[PDB]
Amino acid sequence: NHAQNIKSAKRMVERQRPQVWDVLEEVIAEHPVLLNRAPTLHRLGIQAFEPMLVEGKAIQLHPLVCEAFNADFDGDQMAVHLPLSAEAQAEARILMLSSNNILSPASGRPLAMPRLDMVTGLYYLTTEVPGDTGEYQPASGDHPETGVYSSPAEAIMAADRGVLSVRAKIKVRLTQLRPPVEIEAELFGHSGWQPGDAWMAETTLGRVMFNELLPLGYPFVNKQMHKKVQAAIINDLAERYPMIVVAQTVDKLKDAGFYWATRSGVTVSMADVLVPPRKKEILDHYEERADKVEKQFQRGALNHDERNEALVEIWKEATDEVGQALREHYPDDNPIITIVDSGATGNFTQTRTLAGMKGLVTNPKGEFIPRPVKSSFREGLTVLEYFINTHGARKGLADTALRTADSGYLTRRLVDVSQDVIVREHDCQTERGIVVELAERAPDGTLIRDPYIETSAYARTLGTDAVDEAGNVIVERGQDLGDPEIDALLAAGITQVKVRSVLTCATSTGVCATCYGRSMATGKLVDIGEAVGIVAAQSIGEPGTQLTMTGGLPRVQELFEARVPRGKAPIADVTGRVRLEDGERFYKITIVPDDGGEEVVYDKISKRQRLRVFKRVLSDGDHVEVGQQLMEGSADPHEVLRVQG
Amino acid sequence: GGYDTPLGITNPPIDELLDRVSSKYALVIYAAKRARQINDYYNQLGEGILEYVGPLVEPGLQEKPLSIALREIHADLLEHTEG
């Protein structure tokens, strides 16, 4: 009873009677909205959130989703939509909820993994500094050791009083945390009963308080929270635990990260940017080398382009020497190096341009200016050096604008091709599947891990059973190919695994499910309606802006377009020993066929192409393969289709 | 096992919910059609009665019907066939 029709209610809404906020809270409770940043590069660009009323006029947004949205707070605006139907509210509530989308569609890594402030706070909270206050010493002569605590709460009171620094080494006795696997298994009979455990650990207080954020079922960590270590931790949490525990853990991690981001004291002072004391002598010696090169060109002993290249090599080596001297000069408590060394953000080269040397700045064309900028940004540039730097700055901004436009076009083409590949069947049940390399060994006898296992061999359903010299069938047909089975096959030593894939899915209408393997968004198997074409197109087209440019994004763009490469490195057509021969401005390399066939002539092999080194360098009379690349460079896809099937 | 208590829109936990359905799409349409039935029952409460059953869970004070359907699915009082 606040209006006798909808018209009285409408004028109540316009005239804003103060009960309407209570009614608004009533209608808002459990009613998710959609959020949306400007251009939606990928599927995580639209999420769903339960709203809550906030004074002011700006959308308060949770800080852990700005990584997924790619939305910094420099004045960027986000649109808000709203579902109305019961079906639409269910779709937004279960599917597009924020906590349900933590992992990538691309690589399955968590995108809600914390960053700059949270990562720096956790890094300060989990680093260990020796000689800190309240440190455990094992010194027990007349005095005892004075470094042990029965409880982390006792340690907390000892830190609240000015006794314990949180990064000091201590020996507490934890009763509510799982010890790491060694101490647990050696302490009792594999029943890691961390409710009833009672065990000691020589750690920091900070790592104890940090592992209090993690679940009880998780073991202890006892490490220093680099960003890669936190990525591995949230990966293990997501692939082992339900996603709600991952969401609550990530939320607790954010709060502790901010609370220790304040206390970390990472400021920036002009005294906190130190220049190396032996910088000037380094620049003096390399200036002597540069002056010798300049005198050598002044004699006419070499050409102008070659002395440009000589100065380029000299100043690149000089810049790298400056970077090494700065690396050894800085201590780790320096906040500028602490930010990078945590892995919060930034490369070392930003610190090198801050203090040290700017280096070599590019031409407008892309060439290198032979005069290096020998002054740091802390020392202040001069006018000509600023005029030199402006070229690269302007070209970088123009490249960024063109790159986001071209990435939009590439995603347009990819969505318009792959929009009709959805999962339609549970199993096409062929045996046809590709073979994956999966950690080819070392000649000393070591099954050394291939780098691109987590991009290729992960998350796929095995079409073949895994057997070890027909001993034990170690992994059956149709396992997910996650971590422990990969470790098992690595221990077994077998490498080539004929896994199923969508390149050989026997279903016609789209692809089946087992040939698609594990969904990256869930970690479970893909459901039977998920449009993996659009997921694939968005995951390919999204990070193209970070592609830094024959090679680069146009090279990627022509690669899908099946274009002819301009640096068309040739291939063999048959086996046999080569007739390597170099003509006049372009080479004339023939190949003796090993079979009954003709001596295959290759005519236009220009001087910019080089002999492919493989196995040692290419030589004349080297026995070639069927479709082995003649020169090292870009092979066309159309003829390598026509050769190698 | 012992994880936490949820609150707000994530109650009941959907990872627990997905033990009770094949796909999450089936979960979506499950909850949606139950919510349409609950909403029509609330519309049919002013008029006479028919077989449109009410909220099998004792609902909240002022609850959205979708949440009642979600808690009903989590309580496993319902049953469903695919297409």
Binding site: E87, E91, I422, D527, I528, G529, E530, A531 | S23, Y25, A26, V28, I29, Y30, K33, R34, Q37, V53, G54, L56, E72, L77, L78, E79, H80, T81, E82, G83
Partner: peptide, 24 residues
């Protein structure tokens, strides 16, 4: 026809258990 729109998911009949109808 992708996700919720496909015919295996769109045509779900939803009705409570007959035990639950005996609960009220």
């Amino acid at each position: 026809p992708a996700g919720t729109g496909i015919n295996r998911y769109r045509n779900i009949a939803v009705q409570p258990t007959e035990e639950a109808r005996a609960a009220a």
